[PDB]
Design a binder for these strands. Sequence first.
RNA 1: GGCUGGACUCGUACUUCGGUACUGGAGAAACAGCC
Length: 17
Amino acid sequence: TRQARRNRRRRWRERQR
RNA sequence: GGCUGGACUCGUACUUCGGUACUGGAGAAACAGCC
């Protein structure tokens, strides 16, 4: 599913926010 | 959270109008796994 990018991309990206 | 993604509900695109697809969009690094 898309909830992988919403956990993989989400975990590497939130780090920036 | 130290790491991954399997649903949701949305917003937005599509589309048979069901339903899926976009986390270069959130609630929410929530829940599951290991907890």
